[PDB]
Design goal:
Helix content: over 70%
Number of domains: 1
Structural class: mainly alpha
Strand content: under 5%
Number of strands: 0
Radius of gyration: 13 Å
Number of helices: 6
Shape: globular
Largest sheet: none
Oligomer: monomer
Distance between the termini: 27 Å
Order of helices and strands: HHHHHH
Length: 101
């Protein structure tokens, strides 16, 4: 998992988001579960670069995995939607969260 997280983070910091997405998909397909660091790296770059389509796709994976309770991940979702100008989606994530900080 650290191997995937390390290369995904490097690609995200470099703005190579299509490549990062393909690695994220490969992770999931092999059964190497993304963790809060995986989601954080991708969503942070989506927020920085306005990558709304990738951020929405990642949101779909969050719902599949068991991260519907992770505050770090849901904070990163709110930040991504916010920075992309989708404040109604951001508010919805906030509203569905069991525990905010």
């Amino acid at each position: 998992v650290v191997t995937y997280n390390t290369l995904i983070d490097g690609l995200c910091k470099a703005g190579k988001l299509d490549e990062a997405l393909k690695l994220f998909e490969e992770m999931v397909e092999k059964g190497i579960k993304p963790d809060e660091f995986t989601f954080s790296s991708v969503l942070k770059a989506c927020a920085r670069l306005g990558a709304l389509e990738l951020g929405k796709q990642i949101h779909g994976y969050v719902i599949k995995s068991g991260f519907e309770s992770n505050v770090v991940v849901y904070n990163a979702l709110i930040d991504m939607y916010s920075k992309c100008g989708l404040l109604e989606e951001a508010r919805k994530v906030f509203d569905e969260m069991p525990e905010k900080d």
